[PDB]
Amino acid sequence: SQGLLGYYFSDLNFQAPMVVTSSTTGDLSIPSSELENIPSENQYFQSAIWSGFIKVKKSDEYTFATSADNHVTMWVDDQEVINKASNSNKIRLEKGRLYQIKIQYQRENPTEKGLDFKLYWTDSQNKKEVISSDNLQLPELKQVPDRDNDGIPDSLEVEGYTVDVKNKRTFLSPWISNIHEKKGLTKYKSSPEKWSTASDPYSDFEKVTGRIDKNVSPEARHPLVAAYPIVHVDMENIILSKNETISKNTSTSRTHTSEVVSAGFSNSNSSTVAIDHSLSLAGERTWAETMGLNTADTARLNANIRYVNTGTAPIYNVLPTTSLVLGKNQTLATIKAKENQLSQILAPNNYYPSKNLAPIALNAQDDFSSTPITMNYNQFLELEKTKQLRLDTDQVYGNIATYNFENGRVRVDTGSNWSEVLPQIQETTARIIFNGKDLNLVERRIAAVNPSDPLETTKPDMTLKEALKIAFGFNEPNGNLQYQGKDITEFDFNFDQQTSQNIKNQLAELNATNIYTVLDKIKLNAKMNILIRDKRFHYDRNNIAVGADESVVKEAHREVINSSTEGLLLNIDKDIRKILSGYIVEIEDTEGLKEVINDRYDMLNISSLRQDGKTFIDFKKYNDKLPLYISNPNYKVNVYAVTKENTIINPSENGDTSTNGIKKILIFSKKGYEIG
Amino acid sequence: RAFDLYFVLDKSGSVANNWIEIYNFVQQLAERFVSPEMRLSFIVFSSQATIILPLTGDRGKISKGLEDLKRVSPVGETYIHEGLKLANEQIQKAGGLKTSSIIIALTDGKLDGLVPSYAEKEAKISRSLGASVYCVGVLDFEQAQLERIADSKEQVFPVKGGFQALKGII
Ligand SMILES: [Ca+2]
Ligand SMILES: [Ca+2]
Ligand SMILES: [Mn+2]
Ligand code: NA
Ligand code: NA
């Protein structure tokens, strides 16, 4: 990365820091050009301090010197080397050893903006240069008023600072109201008592300075947003066989369990898998019949899975462990990955293995010693009847890649473990779970005060507004807090039982009756849970969106680009599609009598996405592959949507496999002549 | 001694432009076998199977069954086995091995997936109950497929021209 940490003050006595930055060489200058975010009068630096180390490449005697020797004191391994004069003193330096450096600069009469200042050295062959790049390095800023040793002066963390990117340098400067609002950079605040305000493995300084794992989420580079991994298993397809074939696609959703109407408290990871209930082959009946499975047999299960990181930090040497579960609590299997033999890293917002590669098989075909996953007869009927699995993944994530100030590199540190860090994060942050991205539950944690901790007294205040902006990217383009074209009021706020009381009291105290009016006034505390959900959808107890009002569903199908005896072409919104398990096509006569075309619970999967983004609802697919034949132009073709919560997934107790009885929603109805 | 007659009628999308050929064939068989001793049943199948006319010898009911068949709009997959099942069930309930029973299936024999084998099995069940299975081919029907359902190639005729042949074989 860089060399010496530099602090520049507008006063003469180390009290008002205007710039904290580092420079790669002995050139410690800050020209006029780079002072754009400092008030004009404060652009006159009357003192500065620099701090770090040199490692030298050849042992030798050296003379240090600066541009302004009379204004400067310098120490090298705690001995004075310049002092109130060009005190020109040879000092021995051995190669490979590190020597502490401190330069002090005081200038009363500041006739110039910025600072022109260079640190030189001369070897014994009398060669004088500005100290070059691979000699100076930073002080060790690991767990001059800087209580938590992160490198950011206490005063700045508490009053607030801007981080400005130069050409190489990052500038860290105090927040001033009438200059930085206008320009669109954020006001950072952090705890002067906490090296990582979020209690995570990266310091406030590492975060805002980019001395951090390149794979940490960009939002988690804000010192109030926690950087930690969040991993679940996503199943893609399953294969079932008789043990001595049924192949089905699956969809999986990371889950969050409410209690009884209220957001939950646990920090576990879980996903629920839907097994596709649509037909694979034309005459198929019950899974059991297709297989030849009699009453005393066993079934075997195999599946492809990927790991999914929806957190804000990467994982390197240990995947979490997972129970494959049926029903409430019949573990079918433990899924372990070999420790310390990951083939890549598992990055935030990414998969393992990545999408450009084959997924993991629960039983790989090379591996004759992998554990078989079996089911008894009774359980296989359960699986057929519920078509559902759950994957419970623990929070064991392995070692952390942390920054190292003597290397300037990021490396996996074997003394650093996510197990030690996670509990601290959980304890000192508020949790928000938000589903606006594509209706998937995404979790974030924000540093917040425990009002009862006597040392938390100096942690930044966190409002609900700021938390949404910094953690999720809500913004206020034109007065209204929003997320990607969706107003905040299109989302519902739900809290755990205790948070709920706390919020309600805050509102009463504010005289507010409506949380949307006072988002900037509502204070977050540690250990709060907030669940934020798109208002258009119905949610099951896991908070998966499983449906929507009839009105919403009907509206989302208004735009019918093209209709014909082969089907419908429409623009349907990506979220709506996610909650429909299929469609039913029906022909109606003059007298109201009806006949479903695709008249089987397993024949509803007739809709598909196109590359242009549009949905095709394919009439041919279960019409022996032909367009519908409408013998009479006064007949209607009616098309119905079926929501997830309404899907039938097996034949009736009476063995009836039709669409008879299905709760369905009318979304299109035209006469033969109105279609063409 | 005389016959119980079971019509198993393909109303899938693949034969929709020929429903009228199928209807006509049924009407013209209903008009030949008018003896009061004879009973018929009409079954239709696409992706479900439905008894349009329960086995019966009443002339009014048959006539009503024909008007019903005339209203059929063919659409759907071709689950022939669900059609033969409904025939078999009615046969079973009729006395089984007791009756002289006959199934006539009208179809193009274009079957997908597991339907060929489930039709083959239902066909064999039919014969196990003392019934003969005939297949009348619609359009460019699959010869082999229908031979595997019907008793033999003797009981496999085209629709076009197979009224004559099929009445002499009775
Ligand atoms: Ca600090
Ligand atoms: Ca700090
Ligand atoms: Mn067909
Ligand atoms: Na790092
Ligand atoms: Na999981």
The secondary structure of A251-286 as a DSSP string is EEEE----B--B------EEEEEEEP-S-SSTT---
Chain-centroid distance, C-alpha A237? 25
Scanning A19-170, the segments in alpha helix (DSSP H) are: 154-159
B76 vs A283, A589, A622: nearest CB: A622
Query: Do B80 and B41 touch, CB atoms closer than 8 A?
Result: no
Query: Do B64 and B51 touch, CB atoms closer than 8 A?
Result: no
Beta strand pairing call for A429-434 and A529-534 = parallel
**Amino acid letter at B129?**
L
Upstream peptide bond of A201 is cis (omega within 30 degrees of 0): no
Interface check for A420 against chain B (CB to CB < 8 A): the answer is: no
CA distance A522 to A507: 8
Sign of CA dihedral A302, A303, A307, A310: negative
> Any idea how long chain A is?
676
CA distance A227 to A471: 11
Task: Tell me the chain A residues in contact with residue B112 when contact means C-beta distances shorter than 8 Å.
Answer: 281-283
Q: Which tokens hold the place of B169?
A: 């074989």
CB contact under 8 A, B77 and A635: no
The pair phi, psi for residue A435, each rounded to 5°, is -115, 15
Using the 8-state DSSP alphabet, how is residue A462 labeled?
Answer: -
**A354 burial via Cβ count (<10 Å: 0-12, 13-18, 19+):** middle
Q: What is the CA radius of gyration of chain B?
A: 14
A587: distance to nearest CA of chain B, Å? Answer: 9
CA of A203 to the centre of ligand 4 (A): 9
CA distance B84 to B104: 10
Q: Which tokens hold the place of B38?
A: 């004879």
**A474 burial via Cβ count (<10 Å: 0-12, 13-18, 19+):** buried
Q: For residues A293, A294, A296 and A298, what is the CA-based torsion angle, rounded to 10 degrees?
A: 0
CB contact under 8 A, A626 and B14: yes
- Annotated ligand binding at B126? The verdict is no
Beta strand pairing call for A98-106 and A47-55 = antiparallel
Query: B27, B46, B133, B91: which is closest to A585 by C-alpha?
Result: B46
A231: distance to nearest CA of chain B, Å? Answer: 40
CA distance B21 to B24: 5
**Amino acid letter at A420?**
E
The position carrying tokens 């710039």 is A19
Beta-bridged to residue A431, according to DSSP, are A445, A529
**Angle at Cα A456 formed by Cα A455 and Cα A461, nearest 5°?**
155
Interface check for A660 against chain B (CB to CB < 8 A): the answer is: no
- Annotated ligand binding at B50? The verdict is no
**Angle at Cα B25 formed by Cα B22 and Cα B31, nearest 5°?**
140
CA of A646 to the centre of ligand 3 (A): 29
Interface check for A362 against chain B (CB to CB < 8 A): the answer is: no
Please name which ligand lies nearest the alpha carbon of B112.
3
CA distance A2 to A20: 13
- Label residue A498 left, alpha or beta by phi (over 0 means left) and psi (-120 to 50 means alpha): alpha
CA A413 to each of CA A24, A404, A410: distance values in angstroms, whole numbers, following the listed order: 25, 9, 9
Q: For residues A260, A261, A267 and A271, what is the CA-based torsion angle, rounded to 10 degrees?
A: 100
HSE-up of residue A349 (Cα within 13 Å, Cβ side): 10
Chain-centroid distance, C-alpha A507? 30
HSE-up of residue A42 (Cα within 13 Å, Cβ side): 17
CA of B116 to the centre of ligand 3 (A): 12
Q: Which residues lie closer than 8 Å to B43 by C-beta, 6 or more apart?
A: B6, B7, B8, B9, B49, B50, B51, B52, B83, B86, B87
Query: Do A340 and A373 touch, CB atoms closer than 8 A?
Result: no
A389: distance to nearest CA of chain B, Å? Answer: 27
Query: Do A620 and A607 touch, CB atoms closer than 8 A?
Result: no
Query: A579, A552, A563: which is closest to A616 by C-alpha?
Result: A563
Q: Which tokens hold the place of B142?
A: 């699959």
Q: Which tokens hold the place of A546?
A: 């499983």
CA distance A433 to A497: 15
Pick A427-545's CATH classification: 3.40.50.2030, 3.10.20.110, 3.40.50.720, 3.90.105.10.
3.10.20.110
What structural domains does chain B harbor? 1-170 (3.40.50.410)
Helix axes B115-128, B80-94, angle to 10 degrees: 20
B94: distance to nearest CA of chain A, Å? Answer: 23
Sign of CA dihedral B13, B15, B16, B22: negative
- Which of A623, A656, A658 would you mutate first to test chain B, the one with the most B CBs within 10 A? A623
B36: distance to nearest CA of chain A, Å? Answer: 33
Q: Which tokens hold the place of A53?
A: 């180390």
Q: Cβ atoms within 10 A of the Cβ of B15, count?
A: 26
- Annotated ligand binding at A150? The verdict is yes
Query: A85, A147, A106: which is closest to A9 by C-alpha?
Result: A106
Task: Tell me the chain B residues in contact with residue A624 when contact means C-beta distances shorter than 8 Å.
Answer: 12-14, 76-78, 110
Q: Which tokens hold the place of B140?
A: 């460019």
Q: What class is the A228-426 domain?
A: mainly beta
Beta strand pairing call for A91-93 and A128-130 = unpaired
Q: Which tokens hold the place of A591?
A: 């007298």
CB contact under 8 A, B48 and A658: yes
Beta strand pairing call for B101-107 and B131-137 = parallel
Beta-bridged to residue A65, according to DSSP, are A120
Interface check for A191 against chain B (CB to CB < 8 A): the answer is: no
CA distance B66 to A467: 72
Kindly state the helix (H) or strand (E) to which residue B146 belongs, with its residue range. Answer: helix B143-147
CA distance A657 to A237: 24
Burial A577-598 (b: 16+ CB within 10 A, else e): ebbbbbbbbbbbeeeeeebbbb
CA distance A96 to A79: 19
The pair phi, psi for residue A123, each rounded to 5°, is -85, 180
CA of A143 to the centre of ligand 4 (A): 14
CA of A328 to the centre of ligand 5 (A): 15
CB contact under 8 A, A622 and B47: yes
CA B97 to each of CA A31, A486, B4, B41, B56: distance values in angstroms, whole numbers, following the listed order: 107, 70, 12, 18, 18
**Angle at Cα A656 formed by Cα A652 and Cα A657, nearest 5°?**
95
Interface check for A629 against chain B (CB to CB < 8 A): the answer is: yes
Query: Do A208 and A155 touch, CB atoms closer than 8 A?
Result: no
CA A575 to each of CA A146, A435, A613: distance values in angstroms, whole numbers, following the listed order: 48, 11, 13
CA distance A7 to A51: 9
Concatenating the DSSP letter of every residue in A355-392 gives: TTS--EESS-SS-TTSPPEEEEHHHHHHHHHH-EEEEE
Kindly state the helix (H) or strand (E) to which residue A537 belongs, with its residue range. Answer: strand A537-539
CB contact under 8 A, A282 and B77: yes
The position carrying tokens 């298993």 is A233
Burial A103-140 (b: 16+ CB within 10 A, else e): bbbbbeeeeebbbebbbbbbeeeeeeeebeeebbbbbe
CATH fold of A546-676, please? Immunoglobulin-like (2.60.40)
CB contact under 8 A, B78 and A624: yes
CA distance A249 to A18: 59
Beta strand extents in A94-135 (DSSP E only): 98-106, 119-122, 128-130
CA distance B107 to B159: 9
CB contact under 8 A, A657 and B48: yes
**A249 burial via Cβ count (<10 Å: 0-12, 13-18, 19+):** middle
CA B115 to each of CA A106, A279, A646, B74, B150: distance values in angstroms, whole numbers, following the listed order: 93, 13, 28, 19, 15
Size of interface A-B (CB pairs under 8 A): 74
Technique of determination: X-ray
CB contact under 8 A, B113 and A629: no
B77: distance to nearest CA of chain A, Å? Answer: 5
Query: Do B158 and B141 touch, CB atoms closer than 8 A?
Result: yes
Query: Do A467 and A430 touch, CB atoms closer than 8 A?
Result: yes
Indicate the domain borders of chain A.
1-227, 228-426, 427-545, 546-676
Interface check for A286 against chain B (CB to CB < 8 A): the answer is: no
- Which of B19, B71, B73 would you mutate first to test chain A, the one with the most A CBs within 10 A? B73
- Judge: domain A1-227, CATH 3.40.190.10: no
Query: A385, A344, A262: which is closest to A653 by C-alpha?
Result: A385
Please name which ligand lies nearest the alpha carbon of A146.
1
